[PDB]
User: Fold Spike glycoprotein from Human betacoronavirus 2c EMC/2012.
Amino acid sequence: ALSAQLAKDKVNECVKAQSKRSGFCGQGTHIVSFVVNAPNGLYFMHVGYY
Amino acid sequence: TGAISASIGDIIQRLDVLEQDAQIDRLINGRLTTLNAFVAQQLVRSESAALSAQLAKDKVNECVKAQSKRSGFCGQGTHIVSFVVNAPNGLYFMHVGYY
Amino acid sequence: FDKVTIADPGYMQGYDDCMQQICAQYVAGYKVLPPLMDVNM
Amino acid sequence: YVDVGPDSVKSACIEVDIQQTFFDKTWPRPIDVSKADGIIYPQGRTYSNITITYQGLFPYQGDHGDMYVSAGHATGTTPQKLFVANYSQDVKQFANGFVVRIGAAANSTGTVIISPSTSATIRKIYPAFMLGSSVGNFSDGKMGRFFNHTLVLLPDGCGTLLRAFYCILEPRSGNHCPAGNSYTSFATYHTPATDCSDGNYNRNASLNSFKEYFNLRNCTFMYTYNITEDEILEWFGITQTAQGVHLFSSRYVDLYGGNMFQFATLPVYDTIKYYSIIPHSIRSIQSDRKAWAAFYVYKLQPLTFLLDFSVDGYIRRAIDCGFNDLSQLHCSYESFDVESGVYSVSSFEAKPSGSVVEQECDFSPLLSGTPPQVY
Amino acid sequence: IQTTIQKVTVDCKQYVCNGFQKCEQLLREYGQFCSKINQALHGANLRQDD
Amino acid sequence: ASQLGNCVEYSLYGVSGRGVFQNCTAVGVRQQRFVYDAYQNLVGYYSDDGNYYCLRACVSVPVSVIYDKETKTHATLFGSVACEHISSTMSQYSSTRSMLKPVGCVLGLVNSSLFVEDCKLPLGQSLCALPDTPS
Amino acid sequence: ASQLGNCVEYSLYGVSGRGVFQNCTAVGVRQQRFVYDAYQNLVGYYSDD
Assistant:
C-alpha cells in the first residue's frame, strides 16, 4: 500500500506532469515517461536527456 | 486464558504447593509471552505512526501553507486552499479541489 | 470528535468514574497515558 | 562426642539483677544499602568490578533491627551482682538467619548504664547466642528454655576467641540457677581485673560463666577461632541450608571495609528455627568501669539487591529493590543511575475484609405424642 | 494522515501475577523480562512525545 | 455472613473472588447462583437469597514516580485518582513496596509536588496532558 | 597439568572449559578464587598460586 502511494505520485510527478524537478524523475533532464502494467504493479520508462 | 488458566493455577485452592509452582510457571511463561507480543506490536505501530507524522508535517508545509501548485493528487483537481483540524490522535485535512 | 465512538480513558476522574459502576485500573496492568497536550492548546 | 572440659564445682550462682528500663536507650543505627551495611558476599564464587543485581539473603533497608546492650553492680573494691536485661523470656524465630552489627559505638565517650550519670569511653564486646529447634520454660516457669541440642555460640578470653558448640543443655539446681532457685535470668561474666590483664588474657572465663548455669552433655562438635583485639566495626551472620549451618564474618577479608565472608560451616542438620541471646556483663569495680558498645541484630530474608563491586571487588554500595519506588527504578536498568522522567511503578491493590460466605434435626416426633415407659 | 497512536504503559508483575506473593517469587526468578518490557514501553512513549 | 459486604473479600458457593457488591437492576434468570458476562469472570448476581448484587473486581490505584536526576527530587503521581481517594501511607492498599515516597487534580493526585503560578518551559522530565513540573 | 600450557583447554576445582591464560596485573577479591563478569563466564585468576 505504501509503494502504491509512491506509484500514484510517480505517475503525477513524471508521466502526466513535465519535469522541472531534480529528484522524482528519470536520470538527467527528464523529457517524458510511459507506464505499462506489470505483474503485481506498474512499470515505468522514464526517458531522459544526456 | 495456560494448561489450567483458572486465573491462578491453584489460586490457593487445589492439589499441593509443589504442583502449584509448575502450573504457575506455565501460566507465567505465556502471560509474559503475550506481553512481549504486545510490546512488539506497539513498536511496529509507533514506527508507522512516526513515518506518517512526517508525512503530515510535509502536508502542512505543502498543501496547507503555500498553494500546492502541485500535480500530486492533493485536492482531486487543481488545489486552492486546505484547512486542518485535530482528529483523534491524528491530523484531519480538508483540501478544496476545483472540478 | 462526536461522530467517532471513543470509549474514553478518563483523566482527573477516570478511576472514580469507573468505581461508581475502562479496565485501565482493574486488570491493573494497562494504563493509558494522557496525550501530552490539552485540547485547548 | 567430644568433651569441652568437665562440669563446674559451684552449687550456687552469682546474683542476677534485671533492669530493662536502664538497658533501653535511643540508639537508632539502621542497616544502610548505600554503605552496604550487613551485606553477605557470595562465598562460592567472586564477581568483578561490574555492577549487577544479585538475588540472595539480605536484610531489608532502613531496618532499625533488634537491639541489645553494661558492667555489673559492685563496690569500690569488690565486684557483686550483674545487671542483665530479661532476654531469656523473649525468643525469636530463625526463618533465614540474622546479621549482627558489632561495636559501632567504638572510640567514643558513652554513658555507663548502671550509673546513668557517669560517662566512660566505649569499647566493643562480643555477643553470644543460643540456636536450637525446640523451646520451653524453666522450672520457675519463665518462658525460653532451650531443650534440643543448641548451637550455642560464645565469645571469651576478653574478646580473643569465639567458642561454637552444639550441646545438650541440662541446667543446675543452685540459688539464682535456672533449674535451681532464686532464678531470674541466665547470664555470663568475666573478671577483667584478673583475666583482661595485658599479655595474659585468660581463655576460660565465659565458658566458666556459662557452665555455672547449665551442664552440657552429648556435645557433637566445637571449633575455636582466635580473635584479634581492635576497635573496628565488624559483623557476624548465621544462615542455614541443606548444606549445613554457615557462619560469616567481617574480620578476615574486608576488615576496614565492612563486607562479610564465610569462615566456617558447622555440621548441623537440624532446621534451626528458634534462638535467644545470652545476656552478659562486665565485673569491673566502680572506679574502673567502662562503656560497652550496643550490638544490633538484623533479620535476613530472600531479596534482590543491585550490588556495586569496586575494582578490588568489595561492595561499597547497594539497593534494596523492595524499599521505595525509586529503588525499584534503580533495580531496573542494572545501574544506580536512572534518567530524569516519569516512570510508572507497581500499582497498589485493595485489601480483603470480611470475606463473605453464602450457604434442622427435627424434634417434632419428640414434641408430639405421649412419652412411653422406661422399658 | 493518522499522525499518532495511543500511548499505553502496562504494569509488570501486576498484569502477570494477580497479587499473590508465591507467584511474585516465581516471577523474580524471571524478573529481567518485566524490566525489559517496562523499558521498551517507556522508550516508545518518550519517542511518541518527541 | 451477610452477602452485601460491599468490601473487597467475598467467597461464593462455587467461586472465590475479590468483589465490590452493589444493589443493581434487571439482569439474569435467577436459576443460576452466578451470572457470567461473556467471560469466566462473573457479574455474580443471585448468590444472596433474593438480591441484585452486581459485582466488580478489585480496584488498583495507578502510580508513577519522577526521578528528576538533575535536582534528585521525587514527586509521585497517581493516575486519574481523586485528590482525597488516598491518604499518606494508606492502610487501605497493599506492590514492590516496603515503604513509599491534593495540590494537583487536573490529571492525577501528585503528592510530593507543589503548584506553579504562570508558565515554565515544558522541558526536562515534564508531565502528561498539560503540567510541566519544573524542578 | 601446570602453567607449561597457556593457550588451550584447562580444568580446575569444579569449573572446567577452554581458555587462554596470561599473568594480567590484578582484579578481584582474591579470597574466593574465581572472577566472573556480569554473566556466567569468568574473567579468570587463580589457575595457579
